[PDB]
Design an enzyme around this catalytic site. Structure first.
Site, PDB file in Angstrom:
ATOM      1  N   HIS A  64       0.126  -1.078  -0.219  1.00 48.50           N
ATOM      2  CA  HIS A  64       0.067   0.070  -0.091  1.00 48.50           C
ATOM      3  C   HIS A  64       0.661   1.045   0.182  1.00 48.50           C
ATOM      4  O   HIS A  64       1.855   1.341   0.826  1.00 48.50           O
ATOM      5  CB  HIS A  64      -0.883  -0.195   0.377  1.00 48.50           C
ATOM      6  CG  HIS A  64      -1.458   1.201   1.345  1.00 48.50           C
ATOM      7  ND1 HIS A  64      -2.672   1.987   0.728  1.00 48.50           N
ATOM      8  CD2 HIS A  64      -1.628   2.313   2.560  1.00 48.50           C
ATOM      9  CE1 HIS A  64      -3.460   2.821   1.162  1.00 48.50           C
ATOM     10  NE2 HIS A  64      -2.712   2.972   2.138  1.00 48.50           N
ATOM     11  N   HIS A  66       0.582   4.582   1.047  1.00 47.71           N
ATOM     12  CA  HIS A  66      -0.409   5.122   2.045  1.00 47.71           C
ATOM     13  C   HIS A  66      -0.623   6.750   2.095  1.00 47.71           C
ATOM     14  O   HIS A  66       0.462   7.660   2.299  1.00 47.71           O
ATOM     15  CB  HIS A  66       0.299   5.240   3.740  1.00 47.71           C
ATOM     16  CG  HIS A  66      -0.888   5.775   4.680  1.00 47.71           C
ATOM     17  ND1 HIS A  66      -1.529   4.811   5.785  1.00 47.71           N
ATOM     18  CD2 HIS A  66      -1.420   6.492   4.457  1.00 47.71           C
ATOM     19  CE1 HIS A  66      -2.207   5.645   5.990  1.00 47.71           C
ATOM     20  NE2 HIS A  66      -1.712   6.679   6.268  1.00 47.71           N
ATOM     21  N   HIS A 109       4.241   0.860   2.303  1.00 44.72           N
ATOM     22  CA  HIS A 109       4.074  -0.982   3.779  1.00 44.72           C
ATOM     23  C   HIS A 109       3.852  -1.737   2.716  1.00 44.72           C
ATOM     24  O   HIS A 109       2.738  -2.190   2.056  1.00 44.72           O
ATOM     25  CB  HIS A 109       4.227  -1.030   4.719  1.00 44.72           C
ATOM     26  CG  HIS A 109       2.825  -0.413   5.201  1.00 44.72           C
ATOM     27  ND1 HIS A 109       1.756  -1.249   5.136  1.00 44.72           N
ATOM     28  CD2 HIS A 109       2.289   1.359   4.567  1.00 44.72           C
ATOM     29  CE1 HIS A 109       0.525  -0.018   5.661  1.00 44.72           C
ATOM     30  NE2 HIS A 109       1.120   0.737   5.144  1.00 44.72           N
ATOM     31  N   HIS A 111       1.028  -4.659   3.148  1.00 40.76           N
ATOM     32  CA  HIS A 111      -0.862  -4.772   3.759  1.00 40.76           C
ATOM     33  C   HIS A 111      -1.056  -5.955   3.351  1.00 40.76           C
ATOM     34  O   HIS A 111      -2.338  -6.217   3.430  1.00 40.76           O
ATOM     35  CB  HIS A 111      -1.310  -3.882   2.618  1.00 40.76           C
ATOM     36  CG  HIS A 111      -3.127  -3.224   3.389  1.00 40.76           C
ATOM     37  ND1 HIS A 111      -3.316  -3.768   4.530  1.00 40.76           N
ATOM     38  CD2 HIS A 111      -2.579  -1.835   3.890  1.00 40.76           C
ATOM     39  CE1 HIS A 111      -4.365  -2.854   5.312  1.00 40.76           C
ATOM     40  NE2 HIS A 111      -3.792  -2.330   4.356  1.00 40.76           N
ATOM     41  N   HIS A 394      -6.703   3.768  19.721  1.00 34.91           N
ATOM     42  CA  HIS A 394      -6.695   3.236  18.176  1.00 34.91           C
ATOM     43  C   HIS A 394      -6.487   4.600  17.007  1.00 34.91           C
ATOM     44  O   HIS A 394      -7.701   5.051  17.222  1.00 34.91           O
ATOM     45  CB  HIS A 394      -8.396   1.988  17.611  1.00 34.91           C
ATOM     46  CG  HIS A 394      -7.357   0.882  18.916  1.00 34.91           C
ATOM     47  ND1 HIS A 394      -6.836  -0.086  19.063  1.00 34.91           N
ATOM     48  CD2 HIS A 394      -8.976   1.073  19.718  1.00 34.91           C
ATOM     49  CE1 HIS A 394      -7.101  -0.466  19.784  1.00 34.91           C
ATOM     50  NE2 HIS A 394      -8.211  -0.648  20.192  1.00 34.91           N
ATOM     51  N   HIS A 397      -7.861   5.157   9.388  1.00 35.60           N
ATOM     52  CA  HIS A 397      -6.800   4.993   8.307  1.00 35.60           C
ATOM     53  C   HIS A 397      -7.904   5.059   7.511  1.00 35.60           C
ATOM     54  O   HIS A 397      -8.339   3.922   7.154  1.00 35.60           O
ATOM     55  CB  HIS A 397      -5.636   4.589   8.034  1.00 35.60           C
ATOM     56  CG  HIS A 397      -4.940   5.097   6.927  1.00 35.60           C
ATOM     57  ND1 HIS A 397      -5.165   5.745   6.319  1.00 35.60           N
ATOM     58  CD2 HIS A 397      -4.713   3.840   5.698  1.00 35.60           C
ATOM     59  CE1 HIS A 397      -4.544   5.971   4.581  1.00 35.60           C
ATOM     60  NE2 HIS A 397      -4.439   4.310   4.710  1.00 35.60           N
ATOM     61  N   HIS A 399      -8.495   4.984   3.178  1.00 37.74           N
ATOM     62  CA  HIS A 399      -7.784   4.125   2.269  1.00 37.74           C
ATOM     63  C   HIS A 399      -8.725   5.566   0.799  1.00 37.74           C
ATOM     64  O   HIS A 399      -9.660   5.707   1.270  1.00 37.74           O
ATOM     65  CB  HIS A 399      -8.340   3.027   1.834  1.00 37.74           C
ATOM     66  CG  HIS A 399      -7.015   2.236   2.695  1.00 37.74           C
ATOM     67  ND1 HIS A 399      -5.584   1.847   1.916  1.00 37.74           N
ATOM     68  CD2 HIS A 399      -6.506   2.262   3.990  1.00 37.74           C
ATOM     69  CE1 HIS A 399      -4.976   0.760   2.918  1.00 37.74           C
ATOM     70  NE2 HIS A 399      -5.517   1.228   4.135  1.00 37.74           N
ATOM     71  N   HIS A 449      -9.759   1.234   8.863  1.00 31.60           N
ATOM     72  CA  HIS A 449      -9.978  -0.100   9.584  1.00 31.60           C
ATOM     73  C   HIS A 449      -8.207   0.954  10.537  1.00 31.60           C
ATOM     74  O   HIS A 449      -7.687   1.717  10.572  1.00 31.60           O
ATOM     75  CB  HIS A 449      -8.533  -1.384   9.159  1.00 31.60           C
ATOM     76  CG  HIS A 449      -7.633  -1.069   8.286  1.00 31.60           C
ATOM     77  ND1 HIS A 449      -6.623  -1.642   8.581  1.00 31.60           N
ATOM     78  CD2 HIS A 449      -7.573  -0.186   7.361  1.00 31.60           C
ATOM     79  CE1 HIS A 449      -5.222  -1.422   7.979  1.00 31.60           C
ATOM     80  NE2 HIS A 449      -6.237  -0.184   7.071  1.00 31.60           N
ATOM     81  N   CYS A 450      -8.422   0.091  11.684  1.00 34.56           N
ATOM     82  CA  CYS A 450      -6.879  -0.111  12.904  1.00 34.56           C
ATOM     83  C   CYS A 450      -5.452   0.549  11.976  1.00 34.56           C
ATOM     84  O   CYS A 450      -5.237  -0.999  11.874  1.00 34.56           O
ATOM     85  CB  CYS A 450      -7.103  -0.415  14.185  1.00 34.56           C
ATOM     86  SG  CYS A 450      -6.053   0.475  15.039  1.00 34.56           S
ATOM     87  N   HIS A 451      -4.947   1.139  12.039  1.00 38.90           N
ATOM     88  CA  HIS A 451      -3.239   0.842  12.088  1.00 38.90           C
ATOM     89  C   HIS A 451      -2.129   0.133  12.813  1.00 38.90           C
ATOM     90  O   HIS A 451      -0.838   0.709  12.097  1.00 38.90           O
ATOM     91  CB  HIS A 451      -2.753   2.053  11.211  1.00 38.90           C
ATOM     92  CG  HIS A 451      -2.057   1.953  10.323  1.00 38.90           C
ATOM     93  ND1 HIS A 451      -1.143   0.943  10.304  1.00 38.90           N
ATOM     94  CD2 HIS A 451      -2.139   2.409   9.046  1.00 38.90           C
ATOM     95  CE1 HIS A 451      -0.136   1.331   8.660  1.00 38.90           C
ATOM     96  NE2 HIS A 451      -1.511   1.797   8.011  1.00 38.90           N
ATOM     97  N   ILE A 452      -2.476   0.278  14.121  1.00 35.95           N
ATOM     98  CA  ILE A 452      -2.059  -1.425  14.647  1.00 35.95           C
ATOM     99  C   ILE A 452      -2.160  -2.533  13.776  1.00 35.95           C
ATOM    100  O   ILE A 452      -3.612  -2.918  13.677  1.00 35.95           O
ATOM    101  CB  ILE A 452      -2.772  -1.054  16.568  1.00 35.95           C
ATOM    102  CG1 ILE A 452      -3.013   0.492  17.055  1.00 35.95           C
ATOM    103  CG2 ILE A 452      -1.975  -2.278  16.899  1.00 35.95           C
ATOM    104  CD1 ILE A 452      -3.753   0.009  18.257  1.00 35.95           C
ATOM    105  N   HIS A 455      -3.453  -5.052  15.351  1.00 33.21           N
ATOM    106  CA  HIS A 455      -5.286  -5.360  15.471  1.00 33.21           C
ATOM    107  C   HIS A 455      -6.501  -5.355  14.598  1.00 33.21           C
ATOM    108  O   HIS A 455      -7.120  -6.445  14.729  1.00 33.21           O
ATOM    109  CB  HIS A 455      -5.664  -3.649  16.886  1.00 33.21           C
ATOM    110  CG  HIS A 455      -5.299  -3.734  17.290  1.00 33.21           C
ATOM    111  ND1 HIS A 455      -5.545  -2.738  18.626  1.00 33.21           N
ATOM    112  CD2 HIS A 455      -4.651  -4.782  18.534  1.00 33.21           C
ATOM    113  CE1 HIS A 455      -4.699  -2.600  19.831  1.00 33.21           C
ATOM    114  NE2 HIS A 455      -4.711  -3.601  19.706  1.00 33.21           N
ATOM    115  N   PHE A 460     -10.244  -5.678  12.915  1.00 33.07           N
ATOM    116  CA  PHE A 460     -10.356  -4.417  13.103  1.00 33.07           C
ATOM    117  C   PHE A 460     -11.193  -2.930  12.026  1.00 33.07           C
ATOM    118  O   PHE A 460      -9.408  -2.534  11.997  1.00 33.07           O
ATOM    119  CB  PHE A 460      -9.594  -3.193  14.295  1.00 33.07           C
ATOM    120  CG  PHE A 460     -10.098  -2.926  15.172  1.00 33.07           C
ATOM    121  CD1 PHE A 460     -11.299  -3.131  15.911  1.00 33.07           C
ATOM    122  CD2 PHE A 460      -9.317  -1.474  16.189  1.00 33.07           C
ATOM    123  CE1 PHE A 460     -12.374  -1.833  16.223  1.00 33.07           C
ATOM    124  CE2 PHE A 460      -9.803  -1.070  17.024  1.00 33.07           C
ATOM    125  CZ  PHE A 460     -11.374  -1.102  17.233  1.00 33.07           C
TER     126      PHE A 460
HETATM  127 CU   LIG Z   1      -6.268  -0.814  17.365  1.00 31.39          CU
HETATM  128 CU   LIG Z   2      -0.810   2.750   6.290  1.00 35.86          CU
HETATM  129 CU   LIG Z   3      -5.380   0.068   5.682  1.00 35.48          CU
END
Ligand SMILES: [Cu+2]
Ligand SMILES: [Cu+2]
Ligand SMILES: [Cu+2]
Ligand SMILES: *[C@@H]1O[C@H](CO)[C@@H](O[C@@H]2O[C@H](CO)[C@@H](O)[C@H](O)[C@H]2NC(C)=O)[C@H](O)[C@H]1NC(C)=O
Ligand SMILES: *[C@@H]1O[C@H](CO)[C@@H](O[C@@H]2O[C@H](CO)[C@@H](O)[C@H](O)[C@H]2NC(C)=O)[C@H](O)[C@H]1NC(C)=O
Length: 496
Positions: A64, A66, A109, A111, A394, A397, A399, A449-452, A455, A460
């Site tokens: 991805h 980002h 990064h 994905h 959390h 992000h 897209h 979704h969560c960029h942790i 997670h 998530f």
């Molecule tokens: Cu999270």
């Molecule tokens: Cu990203």
């Molecule tokens: Cu993503």
């Protein structure tokens, strides 16, 4: 320093960014992953050549980019099983897209699953030759990119499923508790010069409270959106966020500590952990001995605004949009949920599903995780924090879009008149109700979704299937894209 037209060869090998050796993921044979740059409006052609052989860190991959809207190239956006099937080892795949109307700091990064944590992650700068802030600094180049990242001595699929970092890396370097002599990153400045530093969190999990001893930071960009300049003495940066800040190197010639304190793991700077060096030309090649002064002017996201003072889309009242959605977080079965549903990747990617004739969210897999959005409209999405989704704050992000943050974490107020816009937001701590608004100007399925990463691995996430009737016509897919799935699906599991 490479791009916008480049090969990115992805491979496995040993790295020791904190002086401890472990297997990881190399890109063009280096760790950390190299900087990619381009200019506003360029076509990027990044040919990702996958030579990975380690199944533990996954042999396949998907990248991805980002921050990039990917308008008309939603097939290039990267997320595995949403926008493509993964590239298979021994194969290569060209991401060919354009960046009209966007300039600023980005990153790329893996994905696929939690692979990026194994080292597939680097910064991207898209320079603007008429940057409206160009007059604020003298230097903006490869040597003013600062990345922050978390580092584990056990791989993603080897350690605890939500592990604790052994080291914060700054530009790919730093120290752990047992490698206190490991080399620190040095960022050099000349007294009298002004620097556009482009700070980017490649983190898989922690957020970093960032500061530089004895210096103020004038923040002028957040997640690729130009801001009104705003001077702070520290800033908290969440996974996948970017800030550009002007540093005036006006202090005495010396070494000053750069500090990046994670919200988890080792939370001090004993022995130069969580740190890099800001060295003035002329200063001794030694560690700083400077001291942290309390931040009395921390970045507050509700005080940030766009350069243009752009209003939030819609009308200035709650629910004053074409569609308003509320994302209720929970957690059960060791899976995160949103509105009751945990994201499992589908075997047919969501983009392919629409191209193959899915008409509605209800048709789309996985069931309960996909939201249909109307075309050419305003949307509002509330992400209220709760203790039921542990590991808060959390960072979420979106897209394919920038969004107005009408309500930020730690604030009680809604700003529709001139809120910051960005593309990764903290959803804060229980009691917060982070609220975002965006426009549906971009047909296709877009991950929210969560960029942790640990997670999103645990479910998530949701998919915004934006303007389904126009997805196929707006995003013509190249044949190499169409070929990813049959090639992937032919792999035996040990080769995935
Ligand atoms: Cu999270
Ligand atoms: Cu990203
Ligand atoms: Cu993503
Ligand atoms: C493939 O990658 C994994 C994950 O990096 C490597 O896992 C290591 O396994 C050894 C021996 O079993 C452990 O002692 C290490 O702690 C692991 N490293 C990590 C980072 O978790 C594995 O060695 C890699 N395979 C090859 C052939 O190099
Ligand atoms: C967070 O904000 C959202 C959006 O305003 C709240 O959900 C709304 O709640 C009102 C009042 O109960 C209802 O009329 C609407 O049905 C809700 N809107 C949507 C889109 O669902 C949400 O309840 C807030 N949560 C907290 C904990 O404050």
């Amino acid at each position: 320093a490479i791009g916008p037209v480049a090969d990115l060869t992805i491979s496995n090998g040993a790295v020791s960014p904190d002086g401890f050796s472990r297997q990881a993921i190399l890109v063009n044979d280096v760790f950390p992953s190299p900087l990619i740059t381009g200019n506003k409006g360029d076509r990027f052609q990044l040919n990702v050549i996958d030579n990975m052989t380690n199944h533990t860190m996954l042999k396949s991959t998907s990248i991805h980019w980002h921050g990039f809207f990917q308008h008309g190239t939603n097939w290039a956006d990267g997320p595995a099983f949403v926008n493509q099937c993964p590239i298979s080892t021994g194969h290569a795949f060209l991401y060919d897209f354009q960046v009209p109307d966007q300039a600023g700091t980005f990153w790329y990064h893996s994905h696929l699953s939690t692979q990026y944590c194994d080292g597939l992650r680097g910064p991207i700068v898209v320079y603007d030759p008429n940057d409206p802030h160009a007059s604020l600094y003298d230097v903006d180049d490869d040597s003013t990119v600062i990345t922050l990242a978390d580092w584990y001595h056990l791989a993603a699929k080897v350690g605890a499923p939500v592990p604790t970092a052994d080291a914060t890396l700054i530009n790919g370097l730093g120290r752990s508790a047992a490698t206190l002599a490991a080399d620190l990153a040095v960022i050099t400045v000349t007294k009298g010069k002004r620097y556009r530093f482009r700070l980017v969190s490649l983190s898989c999990d922690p957020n970093y409270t960032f500061s530089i001893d004895g210096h103020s930071l004038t923040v002028i960009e957040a997640d690729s959106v130009n801001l009104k300049p705003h001077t702070v003495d520290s800033l908290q940066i969440f996974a996948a966020q970017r800030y550009s800040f002007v540093l005036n190197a006006d202090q005495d010639v010396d070494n000053y500590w750069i500090r990046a304190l994670p919200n988890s793991g080792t939370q001090n700077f004993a022995g130069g952990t969580n740190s890099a060096i800001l060295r003035y030309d002329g200063a001794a090649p030694v560690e700083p001995t400077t001291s942290q002064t309390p931040s009395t002017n921390p970045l507050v996201e509700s005080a940030l605004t766009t350069l243009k003072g752009t209003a939030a889309p819609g009308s200035p009242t709650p629910g004053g949009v074409d569609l308003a959605l509320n994302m209720a977080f929970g957690f059960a079965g060791g899976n995160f949920t949103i509105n009751g549903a945990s994201f499992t990747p589908p075997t047919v990617p969501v983009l392919l599903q629409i191209l193959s004739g899915a008409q509605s969210a209800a048709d789309l897999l996985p069931a309960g995780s996909v939201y249909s959005l109307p075309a050419n409209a305003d949307i509002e999405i509330s992400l209220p924090a709760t203790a039921a989704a542990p590991g808060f704050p959390h960072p979420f992000h979106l897209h394919g879009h920038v969004f107005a943050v009408v309500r930020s974490a730690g604030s009680s107020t809604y700003n529709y008149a001139n809120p910051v816009y960005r593309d990764v937001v903290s959803t804060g701590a229980p009691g917060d109700n982070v609220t975002i608004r965006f426009r549906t100007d971009n047909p296709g399925p877009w991950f929210l979704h969560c960029h942790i990463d640990f997670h999103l691995e645990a479910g998530f996430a949701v998919v915004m299937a934006e303007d389904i009737p126009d997805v196929a016509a707006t995003n013509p897919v190249p044949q190499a894209w169409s070929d990813l799935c049959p090639t992937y699906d032919a792999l035996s599991p040990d080769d995935q």
